[PDB]
Structures are given as structure tokens and as C-alpha cells.
């Protein structure tokens, strides 16, 4: 089943995989995540 994050906090960026998928990545913490901005 589908599992992600409806909305994201003001600071995280939203990118797309080289295949079509969608993922997120932090610019400050520089941490890679999956459709979920793992704030820290």
C-alpha cells in the first residue's frame, strides 16, 4: 500500500527519482529520505 507524508514542513525540498518515483532531501542536514522529510 501507499505510505508517505501528505504535507511537508517549510524547509524540506521535494525531488524526483531518475525513474519517476518521488523522494525528499534536506539541504541543511543533507539527509536522504523517502517521501518523508525526517526532520532533525
CATH number for 27: 2.20.70.10
11 burial level (CB within 10 Å; 0-12, 13-18, 19+)? exposed
The answer as to whether 36 is a domain residue is: yes
Alpha-carbon Rg for the chain, nearest whole angstrom, is: 10
Strand-strand pairing, 22-25 and 32-33: antiparallel
Q: Cα separation of 27 and 15, whole Å?
A: 12
The answer as to whether 27 is a domain residue is: yes
The answer as to whether 26 is a domain residue is: yes
Q: Which residues are within 8 A (CB) of 32 and not within 5 positions of it... i.e. 6 or more apart?
A: 23, 25
Q: Cα separation of 10 and 21, whole Å?
A: 22
The answer as to whether 3 is a domain residue is: no
Domain count, the chain: 1
The answer as to whether 31 is a domain residue is: yes
Q: Domain containing 18: what range? A: 8-40
Q: Cα separation of 1 and 28, whole Å?
A: 31
Q: Solved by what technique?
A: NMR
CA atoms within 13 A on the CB side of 27: 6
Cell numbers for 8 = 511537508
Amino acid at each position: 500500500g501507499s505510505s508517505g507524508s501528505s504535507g511537508l514542513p517549510p524547509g524540506w525540498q521535494s525531488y524526483l527519482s531518475p525513474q519517476g518515483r518521488r523522494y525528499y532531501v534536506n539541504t541543511t542536514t543533507n539527509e536522504t529520505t523517502w517521501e518523508r522529510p525526517s526532520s532533525s
